[PDB]
Write a protein that binds this ligand. Structure first.
Ligand code: NI
Ligand code: NI
Lengths: 232, 231
C-alpha cells in the first residue's frame, strides 16, 4: 500500500478554532501515524493566513489531529503538511522521498478570497490554486499551477478524484484509486481541473528527477496533493 | 497536433447500411486524412460480426467515411481501424508507431449482446470490453481488459473522456484533451471505467516498449482507443 500525504479540514465558521487532519496513507481514510513513521512528521502542520505561516498544535484523540493556536476570522486560508525528506535504497542507488499536502479552507459561508491561497508557500513540488474553489460549479474549470523548485512544471500529469468516487470493495488490499480527472500542465505549468461532482476533492501530482547533490544521493521523488471543496 | 486514432459510428438500426468514420487527429473532431498520410491507412477499417472480420468500403464525401458491404442485422458488433506501423527517428534511435481504434456498435435498440464485442480481434495493444456499454448507467462500472501482444497488461494507465467534457483549444495548443477518468489495470489487465456523464465516450491506453527485432528498430509505441455510448 502506497502511503501519500493529504490534509483535511472540518467546516469552520468565524470565531472558532480550526480543526485539521493529517492524512498519511490511502485517501481518504485517515490513519494514525505509526511509531516507526513518527520521525517522518517531525514538524507540525502549518496554517497560512494574512500574517504568514504559523505552526499548529497537535491536539486530539489521534496523533494526526491538529488545531489552530488561536480562533480564526472569516477568510480563505491554507493548511499545509509535509512528509520530511527521507532516504531509501533501491535498484543500486539512493532515493530521497519528499511529500506535500495542501488544503484550501474557507472560514465563513461566503468567503471566496484569493490573496492568501494563490501565493506559493515554497513546497518543493507545489500545486498553487489560481482561483478559489468556492467559485467553481460542477462542470466549470478550476485553474491551478504546478511549481517545482519555485518554477512552473510543464507536461506534468495532474489527476483528481473525490471522496466517494471509488468505494466498491475497499479493503487493506484493494485499489480504490480511481481518478475523476486527468490532464497535463502547459508551458506555464497551468491546468484546469473540471469537477463533475460536488464533494471533498483531492488533486495529485508527482515528479521524479535527479537529486541535486549527486555525491550524497542519486534520485528524488516528490508527491504533492491539493484538497478542496466543490459545492456547498 | 498529436494525432491519435479513434473510430465512430452513426446511429444504425437493423437492415440498413452501417456508416462509420475513421478519426485521425484530436478527439472528437473528425478531419480528412491528409495527402502525406494516406499510406498510413493503407488497409480499410474492418467490421467484426458473427462471421468474423470483414473489410469495409471507403464510401462517402470524405476519405475517412466508410460503409459496410452488406446491410447489418441487429446485435452488437465491432468496428476496428489501424494506423499501419511506421518508423521515425528520435533522440538517436528508431521508434515504430502503431495505433488502433475499436468502436462498439449496437445495431438496433435493446441489443446488448456480448458474444462478439468481448472477443479480442488481435490488435497489438487492445482494449477488450468485458461487458456491453448499453447495460452501464451513469456511476456504474464498465469493466475492460487491456491486452498487449495477446497477453494481459498489468499496471497500464487507462484514461477516458467524452464529447463535450473539454471545450477549448481549437489549434492554439493542440495538447491532448482532458480526461474524466483515469485508473490502472490489475494483474489480470482489467480496469473498471466509471462514467459520470452520458454521451460518446473514448477510453485510451498507450504502451511503449522495446522493439522485438533490435537489429531493425529500437522502440515501439502503441496507442489504442475504445469508443462507446453511455445512456
Ligand atoms: Ni456552516
Ligand atoms: Ni434509433
Amino acid at each position: 500500500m502506497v502511503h501519500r500525504v493529504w490534509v483535511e479540514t472540518a467546516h469552520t465558521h468565524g470565531g472558532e478554532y480550526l480543526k485539521a487532519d493529517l492524512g498519511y496513507g490511502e485517501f481518504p481514510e485517515l490513519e494514525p501515524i505509526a511509531k516507526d513513521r513518527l520521525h517522518i512528521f517531525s514538524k507540525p502542520m502549518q496554517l497560512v493566513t494574512e500574517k504568514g505561516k504559523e505552526n499548529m498544535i497537535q491536539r486530539g484523540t489521534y496523533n494526526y489531529q491538529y488545531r489552530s493556536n488561536r480562533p480564526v476570522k472569516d477568510g480563505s486560508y491554507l493548511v499545509t503538511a509535509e512528509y520530511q525528506p527521507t532516504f531509501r535504497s533501491k535498484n543500486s542507488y539512493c532515493e530521497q522521498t519528499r511529500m506535500f499536502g495542501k488544503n484550501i479552507v474557507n472560514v465563513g459561508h461566503e468567503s471566496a478570497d484569493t490573496a492568501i491561497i494563490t501565493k506559493p508557500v515554497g513546497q518543493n513540488l507545489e500545486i498553487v490554486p489560481l482561483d478559489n474553489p468556492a467559485n467553481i460549479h460542477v462542470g466549470e474549470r478550476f485553474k491551478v499551477r504546478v511549481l517545482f523548485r519555485g518554477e512552473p512544471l510543464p507536461n506534468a500529469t495532474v489527476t483528481a478524484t473525490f471522496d466517494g468516487f471509488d468505494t466498491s470493495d475497499r479493503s487493506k488490499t484493494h485499489k480504490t484509486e480511481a481518478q475523476a480527472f486527468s490532464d497535463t500542465t502547459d508551458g506555464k505549468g497551468e491546468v484546469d481541473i473540471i469537477p463533475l461532482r460536488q464533494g471533498f476533492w483531492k488533486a495529485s501530482v508527482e515528479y521524479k528527477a535527479d537529486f541535486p547533490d549527486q555525491s550524497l544521493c542519486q534520485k528524488q521523488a516528490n508527491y504533492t496533493t491539493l484538497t478542496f471543496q466543490i459545492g456547498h
